[PDB]
Structure formats: structure tokens, C-alpha cells
Design an enzyme around this catalytic site. Structure first.
Site, PDB file in Angstrom:
ATOM      1  N   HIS A  93      -7.505   2.978   6.759  1.00 21.36           N
ATOM      2  CA  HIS A  93      -7.090   2.662   5.400  1.00 21.36           C
ATOM      3  C   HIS A  93      -6.306   3.820   4.779  1.00 21.36           C
ATOM      4  O   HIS A  93      -5.887   3.729   3.627  1.00 21.36           O
ATOM      5  CB  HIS A  93      -8.281   2.213   4.543  1.00 21.36           C
ATOM      6  CG  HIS A  93      -9.199   3.297   4.081  1.00 21.36           C
ATOM      7  ND1 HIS A  93     -10.509   3.381   4.504  1.00 21.36           N
ATOM      8  CD2 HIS A  93      -9.022   4.316   3.226  1.00 21.36           C
ATOM      9  CE1 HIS A  93     -11.088   4.424   3.928  1.00 21.36           C
ATOM     10  NE2 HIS A  93     -10.203   5.008   3.149  1.00 21.36           N
TER      11      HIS A  93
ATOM     12  N   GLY B 127     -11.468  10.815  -2.115  1.00 20.34           N
ATOM     13  CA  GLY B 127     -10.867  11.736  -1.165  1.00 20.34           C
ATOM     14  C   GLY B 127     -11.806  12.191  -0.047  1.00 20.34           C
ATOM     15  O   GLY B 127     -11.376  12.876   0.880  1.00 20.34           O
TER      16      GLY B 127
ATOM     17  N   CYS C  56     -13.231  10.282   2.139  1.00 25.25           N
ATOM     18  CA  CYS C  56     -13.102   9.422   3.302  1.00 25.25           C
ATOM     19  C   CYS C  56     -12.612  10.225   4.506  1.00 25.25           C
ATOM     20  O   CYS C  56     -11.774  11.111   4.367  1.00 25.25           O
ATOM     21  CB  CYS C  56     -12.192   8.232   3.010  1.00 25.25           C
ATOM     22  SG  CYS C  56     -12.864   7.065   1.792  1.00 25.25           S
TER      23      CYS C  56
END
EC number: 3.4.19.12
Lengths: 306, 306
Positions: free
Chosen positions: A41, A143, A145
């Protein structure tokens, strides 16, 4: 003496964390050998996340659209592929700080250390359990991830988790390092039910053993129980059914303390039925289920790494 | 979202930990530049610890009696001196992995990360508060002495703690890196009173703010209070008196949440007087005091290091 929820030393993992940029999206990546792993993603915008067609979105990307940076050093992407919900960016340089490592899909109830990262930079480290419902209760801001979860045995880092998303309920979901989600979750900004979260019974028992070793003994009773009798109680309080495998894993701890597993079950049964009546165990007013039998043994024996 | 007790990434400190051997005694040392720091009781036997004359015991030691090892690499001791309760071993080699660092004497109520080590090898990492009574509630087994506590701002590691001993009560005592004990403790195997341990009020309030930010709001009431009124209650439940300095430190959090500090004090007052009535806050059934206002802000904003 004393008992703390402690993480593995994070140094080996710190040296693998990189910043991955694709368009406006920045998140964390894991640099091992000449491959960088990150959430797919990364290619999505905010709008895309509502209903992404990842194959089509990735087609619009080439090698040069992926900017990878390890602090100051630039990595050249010379290949990209999508494996399930992770993106594998082939880079020109092998990470010189690559530790001995494995990729591992952990079972629910197992614990690991999370290195929380932002912009490719480590923020902090803490212990997590993979909940029975395959969520985790972490600390993940925007952020974060691509932040990873791991265990370290001796030389080897066993990576088991990559953070992908926060559910509307505020719990956390992610994948193994092959990009397969733990649980029924998908990388789409939609409503996603986690399901009933049960308590990890074998972990609670291990922790009770830890307490006894450290001198908290008040909850030890003169009662005993059967597996069936206990599990009847377990079911009522949304505890995982205890199996003979679980009993066998607790064997070393029963041997150290001289308290039979079913006797410890009887104590837990009373705690569940009567509560703690204002008292605490190892500094907690509720029953802790984030220590595995291994964690308790490791900490009570003092196992080190490298 | 989510809130966890997390430690600083330990990599920078991992590269400084060494094994120090003097006679039968093995413990951990901190290798910075060309100096190795360790507990002076490294020179003691079990018998010596009952009533050590450290000056006389050190006289019987020369440079060559101190064996220092960083994993595999041998360090040659070319000088030794005693600074308070720490021993400074001058070695021939500057640590190539020496980070930017300071030595800091922290105030009670401040937090730090402990890297638990055995035989010079890191075992795990966790957060601690320096208790008002200058003890810590850590996890320290035999051989953990010389394990250090630290904070990391950006590039700089600020070392604040070295572990020396466990008291008969099972709590932990140690020094700053100049070898001055926190609290009234001495490096002798004797009975040593810690004194009444109070709760760090400013930390509890900061944590209540953390909860509100993460959506735990049930404890917010329609009441307010004064500093005097509150402190009257604080004294009763062995909480640290709250000062205007404390109020000022919480200002950013009050501004973010729109809850005045004295309104949050009123909530705490009710929690103290009525308990939690079975409910939990940020997954805890008791009031947590191991998060500073800085820790809450850091984690709620997502500050990173290096």
C-alpha cells in the site's frame, strides 16, 4: 529477581530499517541482503486505499518510482515484485548489516518484539502478543507502516510481523514477511471485524509461575481441578481452552516450583471467579497473558543473544 | 493510535557492552572511548561483600588482573582507577562503536531504558522509572550487575544508571556513571532501608492525558479542584505533592486535549477516592506512574532517533 515485560535488543533490526518513498507515500522498509520488503500500500494514495486494485496501481510504477534510503545512503532499485500484500524491491547493494535471519509465521498466543519506526528511523521497542483473533495491541502512529516484529535466538533474527494497518476499533493488523495477513484482514480502508478476543490461558499460567518464583504466592490455594472442569470455567470467561500440549509446555515451570499444572489451574479458576480483591500480582491488578512459558523461562534463567 | 511502555532502541548501547572479569567475579562493563566502566564490587568475592574495604581490596589488584572482552576481541587494561563506587579501566583501544554520549544524573520520577546484560551479552530491554525513593523495580538476575540505564535524544545516548545490587526486599539500587549511588544505598551486602515509595503524581496525570488522546475518557468528571485541595488528597494516598512546575510541564498536553490540569487532578482525586470500579485505563486496572509528560508527548507525536 523481579519480572518485566522486556523486548529483545533491537540493534540487529535497527541496521535493517530503511525509508521507502513512492510518490507522496513514505513508510518503513526492511533491507535484507539485496532485497527491500515493505507494505504494498506504499503505492496507494489516501483515495486509492478505499478500494485498491493493487495489480493495476503497480503497473503504473517502474523501478525508478521507488526511492529507498538507509539514513543517508541511497539504494538503487533494480527490480520490483509483489508477493501477496508485500512489495519486494530488488536493490543493487546487499545490506552489510544483514543479520542471520529467518522469516517465520508465528501462531496466535506467541510473543514478539516490535521496533516502532517512522521515516525509516527507529522510535522505540516493546513486546506484543499475537492475539488469538490475530490482532495486536501496539503503538502505531501515521507512518509506522512497515515496522516489523521479531524474535532473536542467539545469532538469528526471526522476523514474524510487518505492520500494515489500524482497524477502526484502534487495534492493529499486519502480515508475515511473505505478505500473508495474520487473520481475515485485507489492506483496504474498510470496516473489518476482528472477532472475539480471548485470553491466552497458557500464558496466564506461565505468568502465575513467574509470580511464584518471584515470591508472589497469595493466590495459591488448597484446591485442585480437572482439565474439563477448568475448561468449563475458561469458556465462561473467554479464555482459550487449555490442552495437554499446553500442560506439557508448562512442565519445566511446574518442576522448578513444585506446583502441578492442574493445581495452578485451580488457583486461576478462583482468581477468575473471585477476582483479585484489590491485591496485585507482579505489579498488576489484572491477569497478564503476554508472557509465553518460553518468555518466563528465558527471563528467569537469563538467556542472552550474541 | 495505542499506547505502550516502550524502551529506546538499544543498538547504540549494545555496541558498548563488554564482559569484565576480575578473579572469580564476572559482570558487565560499559566501553566508551578508551575507558571501561563497571561496578567496583567486581573485585569482591562473596565473602568480601559482607564488609568490603574497597581501597585495600583494589590495592591487591593490578592492570593485568582485569580481563575485558567485547564478544571475541580482547581489551588490554593499561590503567585502573576507582571513582566512587565505579571502576574506570583504561584500555589500549578506543571503542569504534562509541556513540555520542553524556553522563547524566537523573531526578526521581524520570524514566529510562535498561539494557539487561549477562556475561557482557544483551538479554533484553525495558523501561523503568527512578522511584521517588531512588530504587528501581527492574529485572536483574545474578550477573546483571554493570547493566546500564539510558535515554537517547537524536544522536546522543545519555547514560544515567548502572546496576549494582538487589536489596533484601527485592528492589534494585545502583549509581550514575560517576559511581554515586542514587539514594542512601551502599555497595555492601547488608540490610538497607529504601523508605516509603510514593507515586509519581505528574506521571499519572500525563498518562491520564495519554488515555484521553487514545479515547479512554470514562474517568473525566464534571468536577474541579485546587492544588491545595488536591495535595491534601495526594498526601493521604502517598502521592508526590503536585507543584506549579509540574502543572507547567503538563501544559502541552492540556493544550492538545483541552482539559485543564486542575480538571484532570479532579478526575484523579475521584479515582483515588473511589477506585476504578472494575474498569481499566489503557489496559491497566491501576494508575500507571512510569510515563513522564515527555514520554507521552514523544509517543503521541512519534519522535525518532538517528
Amino acid at each position: 529477581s523481579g519480572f518485566r515485560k522486556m523486548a529483545f535488543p533491537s540493534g540487529k533490526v535497527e541496521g535493517c530499517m530503511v525509508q521507502v518513498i513512492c510518490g507522496t507515500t513514505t513508510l518503513n522498509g526492511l533491507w535484507l541482503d539485496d532485497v527491500v520488503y515493505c507494505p504494498r500500500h506504499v503505492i496507494c494514495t489516501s483515495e486509492d486505499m478505499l478500494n485498491p486494485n493493487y495489480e493495476d496501481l503497480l503497473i503504473r510504477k517502474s523501478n525508478h518510482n521507488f526511492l529507498v534510503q538507509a539514513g543517508n545512503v541511497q539504494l538503487r532499485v533494480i527490480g520490483h515484485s509483489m508477493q501477496n500484500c508485500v512489495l519486494k524491491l530488488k536493490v543493487d547493494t546487499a545490506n552489510p548489516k544483514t543479520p542471520k535471519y529467518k522469516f517465520v509465521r508465528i501462531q496466535p498466543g506467541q510473543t514478539f518484539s516490535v521496533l516502532a519506526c517512522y521515516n525509516g528511523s527507529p522510535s522505540g521497542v516493546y513486546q506484543c502478543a499475537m492475539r488469538p483473533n490475530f490482532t495486536i495491541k501496539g503503538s502505531f502512529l501515521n507512518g509506522s507502516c512497515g515496522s516489523v516484529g521479531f524474535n532473536i535466538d542467539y545469532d538469528c533474527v526471526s522476523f514474524c510481523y510487518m505492520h500494515h494497518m489500524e482497524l477502526p476499533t484502534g487495534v492493529h493488523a499486519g502480515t508475515d514477511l511473505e505478505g500473508n495477513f495474520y487473520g481475515p484482514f485485507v489492506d483496504r480502508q474498510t470496516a473489518q471485524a476482528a472477532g472475539t478476543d480471548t485470553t491466552i490461558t497458557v500464558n496466564v499460567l506461565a505468568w502465575l509461575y513467574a509470580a511464584v518464583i518471584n515470591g508472589d504466592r497469595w493466590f495459591l490455594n488448597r484446591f485442585t481441578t480437572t482439565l474439563n472442569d477448568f475448561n468449563l470455567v475458561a469458556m465462561k470467561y473467554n479464555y482459550e481452552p487449555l490442552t495437554q500440549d499446553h500442560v506439557d509446555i508448562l512442565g519445566p515451570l511446574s518442576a522448578q516450583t513444585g506446583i502441578a499444572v492442574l493445581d495452578m489451574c485451580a488457583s486461576l479458576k478462583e482468581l477468575l471467579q473471585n477476582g483479585m480483591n484489590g491485591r496485585t500480582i507482579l505489579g498488576s491488578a489484572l491477569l497478564e497473558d503476554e508472557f509465553t512459558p518460553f518468555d518466563v523461562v528465558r527471563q528467569c534463567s537469563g538467556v542472552t543473544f550474541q
